[PDB]
Structure 1
Amino acid sequence: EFLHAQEEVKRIQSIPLVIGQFLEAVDQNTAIVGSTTGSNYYVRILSTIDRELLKPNASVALHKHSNALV
């Protein structure tokens, strides 16, 4: 069921996504991103993600209307 939950997360990564730009961590799962919509955001990061490919200034995907860094 830990495995189940990891299969169940997936849905959030449903296409289509909005490419944005990671800016900086905050806590151990929340970060500051910037859509290519112009705005910034303070969103939850999706658990189970290579936590440290995340930093440099890497491109990321946000979940259209919720903006979760998936």
Structure 2
Amino acid sequence: KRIQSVPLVIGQFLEPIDQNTGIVSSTTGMSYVVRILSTLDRELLKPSMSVALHRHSNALVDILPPEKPDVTYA
């Protein structure tokens, strides 16, 4: 749970290859293979979601998720 703390680095999931390994094309520019950790969902990742990585390893850590009409029939 320690490394899951700061200072992380962002990325962008692309696709899996195994029960415990996926890939990323981060914002830094390049593409890296990387292993997800357990204690973590899987159901919520396959698209180009948003993610968070561990800097030096370039590992993976945890997930992160996120006009006004005013009228009425009277």
TM-score (norm 1): 0.80
The partner residue of 2:13 within 22, 28, 34 is 22
Gap runs ≥5 in structure 2: 62-74
Deviation beyond 6 Å, 4+ runs, structure 1? none
Q: How does 1:1-70 map to 2 (within 5 A)?
A: 10-70=1-61
Partner deviation per Cα, 1:2-34 (whole Å, 9 max, x = no partner): xxxxxxxx1121211111000100110100111
Structure possessing the higher radius of gyration over alpha carbons = 2
C-alpha distance in structure 1 between counterparts of 2:7 and 2:45, whole Å: 20
Q: Letter of the aligned partner of 1:58 in structure 2?
A: M
RMSD, matched Cα: 0.9
Alpha-carbon distance in 2 for matches of 1:25, 1:15:
25
Pairs aligned (count): 61
Q: Percent of pairs identical after alignment?
A: 80
**TM-score of the pair, normalised by structure 2:** 0.76
